[PDB]
Amino acid sequence: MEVIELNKCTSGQSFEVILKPPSDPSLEEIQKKLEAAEERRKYQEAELLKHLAE
Amino acid sequence: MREIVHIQAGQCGNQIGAKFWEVISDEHGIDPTGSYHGDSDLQLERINVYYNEATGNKYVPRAILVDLEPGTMDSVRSGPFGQIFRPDNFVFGQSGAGNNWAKGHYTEGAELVDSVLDVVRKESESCDCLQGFQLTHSLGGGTGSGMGTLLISKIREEYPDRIMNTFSVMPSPKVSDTVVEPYNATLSVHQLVENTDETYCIDNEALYDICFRTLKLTTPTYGDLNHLVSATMSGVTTCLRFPGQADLRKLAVNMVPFPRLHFFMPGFAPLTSRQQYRALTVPELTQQMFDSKNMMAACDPRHGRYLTVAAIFRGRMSMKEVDEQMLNVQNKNSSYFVEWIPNNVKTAVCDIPPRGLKMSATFIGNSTAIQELFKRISEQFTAMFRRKAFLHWYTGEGMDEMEFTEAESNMNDLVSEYQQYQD
Amino acid sequence: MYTFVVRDENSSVYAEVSRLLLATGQWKRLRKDNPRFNLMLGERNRLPFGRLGHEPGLVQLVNYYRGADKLCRKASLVKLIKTSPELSESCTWFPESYVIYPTNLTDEREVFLAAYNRRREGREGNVWIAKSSAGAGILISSEASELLDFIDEQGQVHVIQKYLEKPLLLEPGHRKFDIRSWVLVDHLYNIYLYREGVLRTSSEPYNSANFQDKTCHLTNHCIQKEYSKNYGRYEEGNEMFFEEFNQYLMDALNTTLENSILLQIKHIIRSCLMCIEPAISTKHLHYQSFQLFGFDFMVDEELKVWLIEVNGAPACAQKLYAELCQGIVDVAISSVFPLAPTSIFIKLHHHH
Amino acid sequence: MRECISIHVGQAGVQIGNACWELYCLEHGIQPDGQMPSDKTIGGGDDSFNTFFSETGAGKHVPRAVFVDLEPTVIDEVRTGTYRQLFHPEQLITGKEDAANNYARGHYTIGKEIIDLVLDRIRKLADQCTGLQGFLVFHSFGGGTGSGFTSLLMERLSVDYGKKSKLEFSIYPAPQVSTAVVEPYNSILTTHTTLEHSDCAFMVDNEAIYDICRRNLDIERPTYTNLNRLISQIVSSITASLRFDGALNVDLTEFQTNLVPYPRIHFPLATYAPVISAEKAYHEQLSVAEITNACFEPANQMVKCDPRHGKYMACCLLYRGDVVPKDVNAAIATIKTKRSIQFVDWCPTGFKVGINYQPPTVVPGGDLAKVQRAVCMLSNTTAIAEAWARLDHKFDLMYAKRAFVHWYVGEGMEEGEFSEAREDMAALEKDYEEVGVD
Ligand SMILES: Nc1nc2c(ncn2[C@@H]2O[C@H](COP(=O)(O)OP(=O)(O)OP(=O)(O)O)[C@@H](O)[C@H]2O)c(=O)[nH]1
Ligand SMILES: Nc1ncnc2c1ncn2[C@@H]1O[C@H](COP(=O)(O)OP(=O)(O)CP(=O)(O)O)[C@@H](O)[C@H]1O
Ligand SMILES: Nc1nc2c(ncn2[C@@H]2O[C@H](COP(=O)(O)OP(=O)(O)O)[C@@H](O)[C@H]2O)c(=O)[nH]1
Ligand SMILES: [Ca+2]
Ligand SMILES: [Ca+2]
Ligand SMILES: [Ca+2]
Ligand SMILES: [Mg+2]
Ligand SMILES: [Mg+2]
Ligand SMILES: [Mg+2]
């Protein structure tokens, strides 16, 4: 039941109590994932107009 | 500013669209001249969703009236709220459609479609942000069915990423105009399966039984049947027209688990007969609203299973008491709801009740029981198409028997699709 | 109309509670995966507690106490008794036991030998018994070499404890036996003892000079009905009930089952369940729990009660399924979901 | 002094930001017009409140925050609300149509168009920071914007602000205050792409806030305002260290050092007490031992779970009010002897305590009563994985039939990103079990 790192100031205080001791994607790859999804939206809307043209 | 473009096509389309505007115009405080005389700011809050603001504080319904003969639209323009509609928005022919899908879709309608679209593009080019389109029409006639679905096919081409909403009146031999209504309905159902996001199915047979049995009306008219459609269209559009925590797309994202299964069964409550003054409790609203005798699909839900359900409660009531009763119907009949979609039943409260009602409730069900509807239509279809009866009305307009066989197969698939998801 | 689900088809106990709930016309059964339920009859292993108590409007009840495994596992019970100050290592009603991990995997191997050498040096009876949870696999021997060499042959945790070389025997027969009491704990944590217990007796004369033949040393209902040659001789199914046993204690020892044995049984149950209350109580939880227990006891020639093991998913004697189950509905289920005596239990009041 | 930039995403993020910045002003004594009489340095200063507020030559204190929503309906309230003069227009970014509760929509379809505009509006705040610490991102799991656009924002912040830290304030989906059926999809989608980019995340389950409002505040049907006013109390108690003089949790880096020994397991459970109804006649003020002990009651945990059946990795006690270290230790001893506190064997069994003497500030006319002492306990328990199980289960119920998948595929997302995110959650559930169970 020890108390360490007791630091005090005008607005309060803080300390630590020990009960027992122990025992990313770059900017190129994001633009590619976004443009890849847009390309699949453009392809889908294409098959939609192609079907509407038929 | 999320605006909705309204389109009403054909006899049935316009007569229903008419009352729908009469009903909501009342709730929003709009008189037959487009002037506001309400008492609450809730009315004008989401007003621009269905109305355009002209000069002098005028509210002009954002609606397009379409028909191939003047008859029906002449009545609207002379009806009660007829003056409210924009004069240009009246687009009509003269030859008529002869209750022929072929004429509405390929010949007569094709001559007028490009002009109705020129008005559609006009109302959209003013919308700050267009939610989508809603169409009112029947499927058994010639214009709203044959031409209406032709409009949808074309609106989806010019606005491929906007919501296409419809109120579709299904034909019923018990309320039949002509024997070819199954032909027309089977053809339009395929267009709706492919090109609409949401279709509120409205079986005229259901409306008849409701006016005859529950409402105790000796001889029903198309006028009595439209009173219901008004009350029902007003309810389902409450989420859109009043402040509440909902746009067209959000509704589809939360209701349509699969593309082709987007036909709903609406339901209303109360349905009292003139004992009309008895105050109606929240339990009673709920026990009726789920009762099959209060639905407009003529389908026994106990024969199918619900995929998603929405319910809107209108009036000054206990939101804690609403929750307790909705959560009760679910837990007492969980055998009729699919277990693979969590929380597939939602509830929304509204403080503004319909005209002449202390509190009401509207029901939006995406039930697999709706296959019984497409089953009747597909039965009445085959009974005639196996002998080629009345085909000449259509092959004379340019169609072929192959296109009929394909629409037949197109809907039988729709039935099998609703079947595999019922097990 | 209350709803419940069934996720353990192999449970003979709650298969009857389900039949009784449906027999009330007010309890509807649902598929084993439907989350809208008032009552859960969950599986034995890997029961998903974390998914209970999150359905708005529903007050959900489950038939197992999360964490009760600390009391219903061979190695768990030992570690709990020696670590919990409420019981202490000097606990007087639990046999001297040690946890022994096989040498192919803490471990009390050396502490067992210490108390083993002390007994072998003192001439005192040094007969031990090895056992584990994954058994159906027990070795009774007075040699530590055979016990330790037997555990190394297995691949799971075992336990060695003192074998009662002086167990109480019934006459005529000169036979061993055990006592099974049933205890139901409701959501409020009331501890109800089923007035009816059973003695799973042995049909072979107890032979302390031959721990090799385990037919006269073990009193499991399946062993006697397979390896014993006197099954069903003195009583029906090696099962004596509290009326006949309370009569035998009076004609032979001049005492009652209430005094000589039951007072000890009622105390052990209290001390065990009171110990783990602050760890399994559902008093401030979003769902409620209740579980049925089956305690097994030993009786030595001195009429002292020793604790064997606790079963979290126990069975019941054939003759007592009707009364007990209905009592479960009365004090465990209908106590939470009322329906539209002479309690068949004995409440064991305590301090929560 | 080092600055902290807050970002509020989606309707949930914005409204909760509204309730927090409302509270920050009352705590630091900042009027709605941005004036601060107590501050004596006019137009500058490196005080503790300057980690959240910047100053103008005109004496105005402006929050270092950015509000982003793909639909302008919710942010418009802020522009004409009580605190309309606090922010300037550049801080409030609004689209024209939202994401329809569609993760794929917020992340791909709409996100691409507005991502650069946000970063620019953010970079403008960053250019005023002499030593930016990191970001506080408030959002929801269920909303298509909070879920779909956030994960994209985090991916970019890790690019334009590498060494900086990022904390989350996520909202866990609860069917009692939601009309969205697909939120399990969105939650598991956003947690997957955001995981490696959030150094520490505080989850608030709306279910938990809902009951705390009905059981403690006697509100029969809580409104978003009731829920947000309460959530900002916790948020205030978690950020108070960054805004007041002190030594515990002085900068964002200290939140991982003290709470996240293992990276992926960065979801601390929170607990708050007391929550007393202001409408009460008058409540007997609770002591330190009494409010501390309440930190181990499931009734007032920001996520409903059972810490008794998990293992703790870290633990902080943030007290606010009339509390001294002597009473804290006194109450801790009592609780260890009665409660179930099982730590992991590779972490010390101990508590870091922080005491701020200023008691919790009461929002005028709010739902909470003025208490003399309150505490917030941040504890990293494997018991919180229960929340992940619940959500992961629902995701399995719908994805088995591919229900609703077409909505996400139709916005450009691939169907394989579902099972991928799911397998990630399956991994995250396994890493939780490897640490707690024996
Ligand atoms: N606690 C709290 N939760 C909220 C609040 N607003 C929304 N939510 C929750 O957020 C979830 C839905 O996410 P939203 O924030 O509404 O969605 P969004 O970020 O605006 O994105 P969109 O789908 O484009 O509207 C629901 O489960 C709500 O419970 C709020 O003000 N406070
Ligand atoms: N220390 C000991 N002294 C005497 N007998 C003992 C003993 N330990 C176990 N036994 C015998 O073993 C039997 C209990 O075995 P145990 O309960 O460990 O196996 P098990 O769990 O498979 C049977 P149950 O069906 O009760 O769970 C009792 O009948 C008892 O006679
Ligand atoms: N509910 C309702 N149905 C109608 C109404 N008028 C016609 N119908 C139905 O619509 C079908 C005929 O379609 P019709 O309106 O003539 O289509 P049109 O050719 O475009 O005018 C028949 O099956 C009628 O039952 C009406 O006012 N209300
Ligand atoms: Ca012509
Ligand atoms: Ca200053
Ligand atoms: Ca990083
Ligand atoms: Mg007609
Ligand atoms: Mg056993
Ligand atoms: Mg939104």
Side-chain angles (χ1 to χ4, degrees):
Chain A
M1 193 59 178
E2 191 178 16
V3 161
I4 67 182
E5 293 188 2
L6 175 64
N7 303 119
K8 297 159 59 184
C9 59
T10 280
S11 66
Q13 48 186 337
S14 63
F15 60 92
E16 181 171 355
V17 51
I18 293 183
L19 295 178
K20 176 197 299 183
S23 299
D24 297 339
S26 62
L27 193 58
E28 175 187 15
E29 302 158 5
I30 290 183
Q31 278 286 342
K32 294 182 176 180
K33 293 180 187 173
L34 289 168
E35 299 175 359
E38 182 179 12
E39 215 58 16
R40 286 188 295 273
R41 280 193 312 270
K42 288 186 181 182
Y43 175 82
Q44 296 183 23
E45 183 159 312
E47 299 301 338
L48 186 56
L49 300 191
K50 184 204 299 295
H51 181 70
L52 287 185
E54 296 161 356
Chain B
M1 312 175 190
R2 48 181 60 166
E3 301 92 1
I4 290 180
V5 166
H6 170 83
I7 308 180
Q8 46 185 67
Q11 178 173 5
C12 178
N14 279 268
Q15 280 168 141
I16 275 182
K19 300 294 295 190
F20 168 79
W21 284 102
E22 180 175 11
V23 173
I24 65 177
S25 284
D26 179 84
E27 301 171 10
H28 285 266
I30 300 306
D31 64 5
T33 53
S35 306
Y36 174 72
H37 291 286
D39 67 335
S40 180
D41 301 332
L42 293 64
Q43 293 169 288
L44 307 186
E45 188 77 23
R46 313 255 294 187
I47 197 73
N48 65 17
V49 183
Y50 283 103
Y51 293 70
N52 266 312
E53 186 165 351
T55 311
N57 203 20
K58 284 285 187 175
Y59 295 105
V60 179
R62 175 183 303 103
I64 305 173
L65 300 80
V66 181
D67 198 348
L68 287 175
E69 58 184 5
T72 298
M73 278 173 49
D74 280 5
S75 295
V76 177
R77 207 182 311 116
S78 293
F81 286 63
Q83 303 294 342
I84 201 185
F85 298 110
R86 210 178 178 271
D88 317 333
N89 289 12
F90 288 83
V91 187
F92 54 101
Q94 300 278 335
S95 64
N99 280 269
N100 191 322
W101 194 86
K103 284 183 178 187
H105 208 73
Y106 288 120
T107 66
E108 311 290 339
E111 190 167 6
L112 183 77
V113 81
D114 268 12
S115 53
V116 170
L117 280 169
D118 282 353
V119 175
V120 160
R121 179 186 308 99
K122 179 277 175 188
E123 294 287 341
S124 298
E125 288 178 347
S126 78
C127 292
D128 192 14
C129 190
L130 179 73
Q131 290 194 58
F133 307 95
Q134 74 169 24
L135 178 93
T136 59
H137 71 160
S138 67
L139 302 182
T143 296
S145 171
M147 183 163 180
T149 67
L150 177 64
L151 283 178
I152 304 176
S153 183
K154 297 219 177 299
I155 292 180
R156 205 194 172 192
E157 194 170 5
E158 196 165 358
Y159 311 97
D161 56 0
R162 307 286 81 171
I163 299 302
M164 184 64 64
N165 199 39
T166 68
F167 304 82
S168 301
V169 180
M170 313 303 175
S172 168
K174 308 308 179 58
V175 191
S176 191
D177 280 8
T178 59
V179 302
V180 296
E181 290 162 12
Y183 281 162
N184 299 326
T186 293
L187 289 161
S188 289
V189 162
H190 176 48
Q191 306 293 328
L192 306 169
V193 166
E194 188 185 26
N195 294 315
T196 74
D197 308 311
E198 299 166 293
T199 290
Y200 298 94
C201 299
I202 302 171
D203 188 319
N204 260 0
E205 187 167 27
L207 299 179
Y208 182 86
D209 290 318
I210 293 180
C211 281
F212 185 88
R213 309 184 194 184
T214 304
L215 284 167
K216 300 299 187 179
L217 304 181
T218 314
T219 302
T221 67
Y222 284 114
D224 296 319
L225 279 56
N226 295 345
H227 169 93
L228 295 174
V229 185
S230 289
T232 290
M233 298 182 59
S234 179
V236 315
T237 61
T238 307
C239 305
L240 317 170
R241 299 184 290 103
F242 293 102
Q245 57 283 158
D247 77 308
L248 279 175
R249 186 176 277 101
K250 258 175 176 177
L251 173 65
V253 165
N254 297 318
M255 295 290 288
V256 193
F258 308 100
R260 289 168 303 280
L261 306 189
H262 60 267
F263 304 88
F264 308 151
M265 304 192 318
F268 192 74
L271 296 173
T272 315
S273 42
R274 299 178 176 91
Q275 290 298 336
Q276 45 178 140
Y277 318 103
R278 178 193 183 185
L280 203 48
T281 59
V282 173
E284 289 183 312
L285 275 180
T286 310
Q287 290 186 301
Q288 293 185 227
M289 182 179 56
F290 279 94
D291 196 345
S292 66
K293 310 190 305 303
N294 288 62
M295 297 201 180
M296 276 122 176
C299 293
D300 196 355
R302 305 178 82 100
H303 291 160
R305 310 185 72 176
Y306 287 106
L307 295 177
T308 57
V309 174
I312 303 77
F313 287 76
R314 302 189 58 178
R316 305 183 70 257
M317 72 196 70
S318 178
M319 190 170 300
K320 168 190 171 65
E321 204 179 53
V322 182
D323 294 324
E324 302 185 0
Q325 291 310 315
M326 280 299 295
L327 305 181
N328 175 279
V329 179
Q330 303 181 49
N331 303 326
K332 298 193 70 60
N333 319 283
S334 60
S335 49
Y336 300 113
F337 305 80
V338 302
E339 75 281 4
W340 37 274
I341 297 185
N343 327 92
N344 67 346
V345 183
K346 296 300 178 182
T347 301
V349 178
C350 180
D351 313 309
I352 302 171
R355 188 57 94 111
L357 283 181
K358 284 287 196 65
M359 61 180 59
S360 58
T362 308
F363 170 101
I364 307 176
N366 188 349
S367 137
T368 75
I370 200 64
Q371 71 173 283
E372 286 184 341
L373 183 161
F374 302 105
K375 279 183 182 176
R376 277 187 299 267
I377 305 303
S378 187
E379 289 188 13
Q380 299 149 9
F381 180 106
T382 295
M384 295 188 299
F385 187 77
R386 60 184 179 185
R387 303 296 286 275
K388 299 171 178 175
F390 309 104
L391 270 180
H392 71 89
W393 296 136
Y394 301 87
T395 66
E397 294 308 325
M399 291 178 63
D400 188 70
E401 297 178 18
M402 182 67 73
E403 172 161 350
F404 276 78
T405 301
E406 294 183 349
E408 188 186 44
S409 290
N410 283 324
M411 197 156 63
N412 284 335
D413 298 333
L414 192 75
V415 181
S416 292
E417 191 160 13
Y418 276 124
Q419 187 55 18
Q420 63 177 125
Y421 291 109
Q422 183 174 301
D423 310 330
Chain C
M1 188 75 61
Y2 297 110
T3 55
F4 64 90
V5 307
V6 172
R7 294 174 66 94
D8 191 1
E9 307 276 336
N10 296 322
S11 188
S12 50
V13 177
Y14 297 92
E16 168 69 352
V17 178
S18 181
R19 196 279 293 185
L20 286 180
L21 291 174
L22 304 179
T24 71
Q26 317 175 24
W27 276 87
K28 187 163 173 279
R29 176 177 181 177
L30 308 186
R31 310 181 190 88
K32 58 200 312 171
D33 299 317
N34 197 309
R36 291 206 181 283
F37 58 88
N38 286 121
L39 179 61
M40 161 163 294
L41 309 180
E43 47 265 303
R44 303 188 187 92
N45 309 116
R46 309 201 61 85
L47 188 158
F49 290 109
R51 312 208 307 249
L52 298 179
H54 295 268
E55 282 302 335
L58 286 181
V59 179
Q60 291 168 323
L61 189 61
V62 66
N63 67 332
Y64 280 109
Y65 264 98
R66 191 186 183 187
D69 53 315
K70 261 60 180 182
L71 206 69
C72 304
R73 237 70 180 185
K74 299 292 198 301
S76 294
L77 172 55
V78 163
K79 182 188 169 184
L80 178 72
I81 292 179
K82 295 182 168 184
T83 48
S84 311
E86 290 88 25
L87 313 184
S88 70
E89 188 194 53
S90 60
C91 171
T92 59
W93 40 262
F94 188 66
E96 183 179 356
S97 308
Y98 301 93
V99 179
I100 299 294
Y101 289 81
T103 52
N104 63 274
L105 273 63
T106 38
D107 187 65
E108 291 176 323
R109 264 182 174 269
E110 296 178 356
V111 184
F112 162 80
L113 304 182
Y116 181 85
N117 296 327
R118 170 183 280 181
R119 280 185 166 276
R120 165 176 281 185
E121 177 194 19
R123 295 300 90 102
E124 303 170 359
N126 211 18
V127 176
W128 300 80
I129 176 177
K131 50 185 176 180
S132 66
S133 300
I138 292 74
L139 169 64
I140 310 181
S141 177
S142 55
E143 297 296 348
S145 58
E146 303 182 6
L147 297 184
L148 296 178
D149 286 339
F150 173 83
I151 305 179
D152 303 334
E153 302 171 350
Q154 302 296 2
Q156 61 286 344
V157 188
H158 276 75
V159 293
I160 301 181
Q161 66 180 172
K162 188 66 177 62
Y163 184 98
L164 299 175
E165 303 178 27
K166 303 181 178 185
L168 173 55
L169 305 177
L170 295 182
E171 301 297 341
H174 197 90
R175 47 210 179 101
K176 189 181 182 177
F177 74 99
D178 73 326
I179 298 175
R180 162 69 69 80
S181 292
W182 291 271
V183 179
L184 178 59
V185 182
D186 60 11
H187 55 301
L188 291 177
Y189 213 89
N190 294 327
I191 305 171
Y192 302 101
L193 175 60
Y194 187 19
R195 82 161 81 94
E196 304 299 330
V198 303
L199 281 59
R200 294 165 295 184
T201 63
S202 179
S203 59
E204 301 296 355
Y206 182 86
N207 194 89
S208 59
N210 175 28
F211 304 107
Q212 184 177 355
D213 186 358
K214 299 170 295 184
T215 300
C216 67
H217 295 270
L218 291 64
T219 64
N220 286 327
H221 190 271
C222 68
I223 298 180
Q224 296 296 335
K225 195 175 181 182
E226 279 290 6
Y227 303 99
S228 188
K229 305 180 179 183
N230 283 325
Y231 182 87
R233 182 182 181 183
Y234 312 92
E235 47 278 350
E236 187 172 0
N238 293 17
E239 295 185 359
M240 179 179 301
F241 296 86
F242 277 9
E243 185 168 5
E244 183 180 9
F245 178 57
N246 178 77
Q247 185 71 222
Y248 168 86
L249 290 178
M250 299 184 299
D251 301 327
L253 288 296
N254 193 22
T255 188
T256 68
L257 177 65
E258 168 67 27
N259 304 29
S260 61
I261 303 177
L262 213 60
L263 281 183
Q264 305 193 57
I265 301 181
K266 291 189 292 185
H267 169 69
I268 299 175
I269 297 173
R270 272 192 59 182
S271 296
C272 288
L273 300 179
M274 277 201 64
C275 182
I276 62 174
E277 182 184 20
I280 65 175
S281 173
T282 71
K283 190 178 180 184
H284 310 285
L285 221 53
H286 36 291
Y287 69 102
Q288 295 295 326
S289 296
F290 77 93
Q291 189 179 349
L292 173 59
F293 295 92
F295 292 67
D296 310 337
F297 304 88
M298 277 289 302
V299 189
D300 65 356
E301 61 185 17
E302 292 295 286
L303 286 180
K304 176 176 174 180
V305 177
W306 300 84
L307 174 56
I308 297 305
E309 83 160 17
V310 186
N311 293 279
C316 178
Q318 176 64 351
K319 190 186 64 177
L320 295 183
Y321 270 110
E323 187 181 0
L324 167 52
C325 286
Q326 179 62 42
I328 293 182
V329 182
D330 284 355
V331 306
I333 290 175
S334 295
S335 62
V336 188
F337 315 94
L339 295 174
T342 304
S343 186
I344 79 172
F345 292 83
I346 314 176
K347 186 174 181 181
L348 307 182
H349 295 93
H350 66 273
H351 298 181
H352 315 281
Chain D
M1 184 277 309
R2 310 185 60 178
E3 303 84 0
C4 293
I5 293 181
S6 305
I7 312 179
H8 309 265
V9 177
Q11 178 189 109
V14 181
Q15 292 180 160
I16 291 171
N18 239 37
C20 301
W21 290 103
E22 182 205 37
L23 190 55
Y24 296 165
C25 297
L26 300 183
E27 296 185 345
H28 299 281
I30 302 177
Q31 301 177 15
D33 53 322
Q35 297 295 329
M36 186 176 181
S38 51
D39 178 13
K40 303 304 175 181
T41 43
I42 298 300
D46 60 355
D47 302 335
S48 287
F49 66 100
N50 285 140
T51 60
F52 277 63
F53 296 78
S54 58
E55 306 181 24
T56 71
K60 174 177 296 180
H61 301 63
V62 176
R64 305 175 183 261
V66 162
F67 293 71
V68 173
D69 193 1
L70 301 175
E71 155 208 31
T73 64
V74 179
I75 287 177
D76 273 337
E77 305 281 14
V78 183
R79 296 189 177 106
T80 69
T82 304
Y83 293 99
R84 58 185 173 272
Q85 294 182 96
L86 263 198
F87 322 88
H88 50 274
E90 277 103 7
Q91 307 173 257
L92 306 179
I93 325 176
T94 50
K96 292 207 174 181
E97 54 184 353
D98 63 61
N101 296 342
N102 186 338
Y103 166 89
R105 193 173 174 83
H107 192 83
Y108 299 93
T109 297
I110 293 176
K112 189 167 174 285
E113 313 299 331
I114 195 171
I115 179 64
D116 293 349
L117 176 54
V118 175
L119 305 189
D120 188 75
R121 299 293 168 85
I122 292 179
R123 175 73 65 183
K124 289 184 176 181
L125 281 193
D127 290 338
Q128 289 188 80
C129 302
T130 59
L132 181 69
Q133 303 183 7
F135 307 91
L136 307 186
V137 183
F138 304 83
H139 66 83
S140 60
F141 280 3
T145 296
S147 75
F149 177 74
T150 293
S151 62
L152 173 60
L153 183 51
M154 306 290 304
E155 282 180 19
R156 286 293 292 266
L157 289 179
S158 304
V159 176
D160 306 336
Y161 307 103
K163 301 301 178 61
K164 280 70 173 62
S165 299
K166 301 187 292 302
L167 284 66
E168 280 184 86
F169 281 95
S170 314
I171 299 296
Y172 190 84
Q176 283 181 319
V177 292
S178 158
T179 58
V181 183
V182 306
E183 290 178 89
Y185 282 175
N186 302 333
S187 299
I188 284 172
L189 282 176
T190 180
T191 279
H192 169 58
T193 49
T194 310
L195 207 54
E196 282 294 64
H197 300 276
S198 186
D199 300 289
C200 174
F202 302 95
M203 287 190 296
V204 174
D205 187 351
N206 268 351
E207 164 188 294
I209 314 300
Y210 193 77
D211 289 338
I212 300 182
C213 284
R214 298 199 303 176
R215 196 187 314 108
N216 296 28
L217 298 178
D218 298 337
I219 311 305
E220 312 217 40
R221 217 300 180 178
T223 74
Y224 278 142
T225 312
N226 302 116
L227 309 170
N228 295 346
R229 290 253 174 84
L230 172 70
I231 293 178
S232 54
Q233 285 297 347
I234 283 67
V235 173
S236 180
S237 299
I238 304 184
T239 66
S241 58
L242 305 172
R243 307 179 279 111
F244 292 98
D245 190 7
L248 168 59
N249 296 342
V250 55
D251 70 357
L252 302 177
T253 289
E254 197 153 359
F255 279 94
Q256 170 272 350
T257 290
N258 295 339
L259 299 176
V260 182
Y262 267 71
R264 292 172 55 98
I265 315 294
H266 57 248
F267 301 111
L269 172 74
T271 310
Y272 196 83
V275 177
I276 304 301
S277 176
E279 291 304 310
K280 267 207 167 190
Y282 231 72
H283 196 77
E284 348 71 46
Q285 280 308 322
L286 299 177
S287 69
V288 178
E290 287 170 359
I291 80 173
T292 304
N293 182 14
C295 292
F296 300 93
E297 292 287 341
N300 23 247
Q301 302 173 4
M302 301 298 81
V303 179
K304 284 194 177 183
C305 52
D306 202 329
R308 298 178 298 176
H309 297 105
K311 284 199 170 189
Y312 293 86
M313 282 166 285
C315 191
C316 280
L317 286 186
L318 311 185
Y319 294 89
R320 300 187 65 182
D322 182 45
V323 184
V324 295
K326 181 182 54 178
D327 295 6
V328 177
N329 308 329
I332 301 186
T334 300
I335 296 182
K336 285 296 299 179
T337 67
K338 278 180 166 55
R339 292 285 178 170
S340 311
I341 307 181
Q342 262 279 323
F343 262 71
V344 298
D345 306 323
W346 47 275
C347 296
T349 312
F351 308 84
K352 287 188 173 68
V353 175
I355 287 180
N356 192 285
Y357 293 157
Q358 176 183 325
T361 307
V362 276
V363 176
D367 310 292
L368 303 180
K370 179 69 175 188
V371 298
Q372 284 309 353
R373 64 189 61 84
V375 68
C376 185
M377 192 186 78
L378 310 170
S379 54
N380 194 335
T381 11
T382 65
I384 210 170
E386 298 170 12
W388 296 126
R390 307 155 49 190
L391 211 60
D392 276 329
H393 192 60
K394 291 174 185 177
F395 187 109
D396 285 340
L397 294 183
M398 293 188 305
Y399 194 74
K401 313 298 183 303
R402 300 297 186 263
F404 296 78
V405 177
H406 65 272
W407 290 110
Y408 299 81
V409 186
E411 295 291 9
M413 191 173 71
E414 312 189 60
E415 191 191 80
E417 180 168 353
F418 277 87
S419 45
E420 184 186 47
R422 186 57 179 87
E423 289 178 34
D424 197 5
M425 296 299 302
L428 190 68
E429 274 179 305
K430 183 174 180 178
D431 288 310
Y432 264 103
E433 185 179 3
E434 281 183 358
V435 179
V437 191
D438 299 0

